[PDB]
């Protein structure tokens, strides 16, 4: 396997003082094997878990950006990120493609631009419950990739890495370690078909569903799945025990 | 008049380095007039300006927000900003309006989540070319207003400012100070007579069209106009120039 990713999404989440006690936490956490952690606070955050974080398996992220600096009240650019020493950014995160406009599209010329830019990209896909139930997850996690693979050039994908968000049992179901290999596999023989063998090899596929120190060791196990975008679990003391699960 | 505003919306533009520039320079601007003002950066340059920013005139604005902390993917929420010690926002900008998806209702509803939170709220309409063409910026303005007066009591206004933004002439034609103006004296007689004349008094409305050292003082001096939601200017040592036409 490649390298693992165990990356925390605190998403709208967060106090000085919680982030203060969990980054301490985070610091005191001895890690013996070869993983890139990686912490994406909201954009206000940011600056303090810089400050803060010095593990040094991590990385800081952003939860999001867009391309250009300019006349975009509220929105942060990925310049204005670089500037400010940030390399990582995590696109198309179901909650954007689901609330906030992020056509398959959208995404796709974002992942271009961050990387164009010389970060780091965590790029979300994932299947609603109409899409699984409809028997439609292969072309739609397929088409979300292709989109995004059709604005890079093969070198670019050493600066990819791929969060599986099965959105179908987001907040709805229950995803099996079982389902969440299937995916993590089609994706990976599409990217070898279609890209190629060694970049298939290499490439992260990490899995953003439900993941917790119950679960974590079960899904690392499986032979497509390369770490974790986790949501809830990474605001508790317990993101430690994912992170030792990839070991 | 009410106490005036300059507010500076630096939008997505910024260097760590710009900034430490810009804010020294703010820093070093003797102001001996009651005016409050604002800077609102990008949010990963808030934390810097609250450090570095501290002539007593200023305060710290939020560019955008969402209601409620969660799983919003890339947001910033209202109790987050709260926490940071932001108390300050800018809500329903016509680029959220025309590129985010911020309906007259959604605005409405973020100006009412930010009052019941504690912000002062810098909360913006305005009509845009076509709208204006086919002569219906009383209808359009009056329209976004009411939005938000609905879900207003009365004693939220003391936290509520206006900002009129002539969106048709933002990148497009010239706004004249006659025309800010007139929209800005229908505003004020709108709210006089459904709202209070009490209100209508005491209600800053600020003009949000390109505002420079050539124009800010003929724009102060119009009855209806309690100062400015500066763009572009606002990144530059202007910005004091117009601090000071409010004098
Ligand atoms: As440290
Ligand atoms: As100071």
């Known amino acids: 396997k490649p390298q693992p990713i165990v990356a925390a999404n605190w998403k709208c989440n967060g106090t000085t003082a919680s982030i203060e006690k969990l980054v301490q936490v985070l610091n005191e956490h001895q890690i013996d094997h070869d993983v890139q952690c ?5 954009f206000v955050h940011i600056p303090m878990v810089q400050a803060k974080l010095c593990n040094p398996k991590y990385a800081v992220s952003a939860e999001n950006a867009i391309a250009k600096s300019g ?51 965590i790029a979300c896909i994932g299947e609603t419950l109409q899409q699984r139930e409809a028997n ?13 693979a059709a604005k890079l ?5 050493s600066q990819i890495v791929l969060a599986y968000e099965p959105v179908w049992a987001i907040g709805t179901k229950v995803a099996t370690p079982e389902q969440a290999q ?15 063998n060694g970049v298939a090899t290499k ?21 497509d799945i390369n770490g974790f975008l986790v949501g809830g679990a990474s605001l508790k003391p317990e993101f430690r025990d994912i992170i030792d699960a990839t070991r």
């Open 38 to 42: 990686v912490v994406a606070p909201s």
């Open 182 to 196: 299937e995916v993590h596999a089609l994706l990976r023989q599409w990217v070898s078909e279609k890209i190629g």
């Open 71 to 121: 006349a975009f009240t509220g929105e942060v650019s990925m310049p204005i990120l670089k500037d400010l020493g940030v390399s990582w950014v995590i696109l198309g995160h179901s909650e954007r493609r689901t609330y906030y406009g992020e056509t398959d599209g959208v995404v796709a010329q974002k992942v271009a631009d961050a990387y164009n830019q010389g970060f780091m990209v």
């Open 153 to 157: 050039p093969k070198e670019a994908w």
């Open 203 to 223: 490439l992260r596929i990490l899995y953003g569903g439900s993941v917790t120190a119950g679960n974590a060791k079960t899904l690392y196990m499986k032979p």
């Open 136 to 148: 439609q997850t292969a072309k739609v996690v397929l088409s979300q990739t292709a989109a995004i």
